[PDB]
Amino acid sequence: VVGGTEAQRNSWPSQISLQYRSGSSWAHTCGGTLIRQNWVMTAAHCVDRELTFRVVVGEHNLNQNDGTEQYVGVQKIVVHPYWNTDDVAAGYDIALLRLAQSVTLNSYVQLGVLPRAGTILANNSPCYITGWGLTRTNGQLAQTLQQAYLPTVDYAICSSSSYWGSTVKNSMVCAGGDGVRSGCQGDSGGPLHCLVNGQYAVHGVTSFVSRLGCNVTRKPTVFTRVSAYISWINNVIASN
Ligand SMILES: *[C@](=O)([C]([N]C(=O)[C]1[C][C][C]N1C(=O)[C]([N]C(=O)C1=[C][C]=C(C([O])=O)[C]=[C]1)[C]([C])[C])[C]([C])[C])C(F)(F)F
Ligand SMILES: [Ca+2]
Incomplete structure (x- = not known):
């Protein structure tokens, strides 16, 4: 992270x-x-x-x-x-x-609480990534578990040309993209926890980042959509 x-x-x-x-x-x-x-x-x-x-x-x-x-x-x-x-x-x-x-x-x-089947989060929904992955692009693993606030980017925005274009599928969730916070190597497979109706549920499985680095503006971390x-x-x- x-x-x-x-x-x-x-x-x-x-x-x-x-x-x-x-x-x-x-x-x-x-x-x-x-x-x-x-x-x-x-x-x-x-x-x-x-x-x-x-x-x-x-x-x-x-x-x-x-x-x-x-x-x-x-x-x-x-x-x-x-x-x-x-x-x-x-x-x-x-x-x-x-x-x-x-x-x-x-x-x-x-x-972990899983979402109901088919659930899709509104744009800018509040979620946290957690993991022990790299703390910088080409850095090193964290010793202690880290969290970062990574709000969602909906499918219509994430799949637009300025974001991920046709790389992203509707079976994925995008979150983050501010250029500061992201998943990074070693976070793969972990949860994206999103607050919905007062409860954190695991909406994402961390999957991949851009070829340009972990934290890249307008390249949100991409997650498998659990729902x-x-x-x-x-x-x-x-x-x-
Ligand atoms: C995870 O902790 C880790 N995930 C990765 O490193 C994944 C696994 C395969 C490589 N990968 C990437 O995130 C890499 N991205 C791509 O390979 C890629 C980018 C774009 C496209 C496309 O079509 O638009 C296709 C492939 C980057 C370059 C490292 C983290 C980052 C979640 C672990 F794998 F364990 F390291
Ligand atoms: Ca320990």
């Missing part, structure tokens, strides 16, 4: 860190959202790779014991069948992970 602020420990309890094994240690690579005690939602492009993964829930600081972490292996990965490897702009950038064991819920570990995939989510969970 570029332009972020440090999140409180208990603000975004559905956020997870998705890590891969690198020799003897584990490294953060993506975010995700806990959606059942044994299922995580993330981006397809995080998990279509030759790596071994684990999930950490209750995480705050990647490099220090928080006293709240639960570490769980990943037992099954289901990528959207229409995802095409390394083609983010085609969409379908979503995957579900069944965890090897159910996690326990507490003030640091809660399920376009609710039937798919429920079908996968029911079948596995």
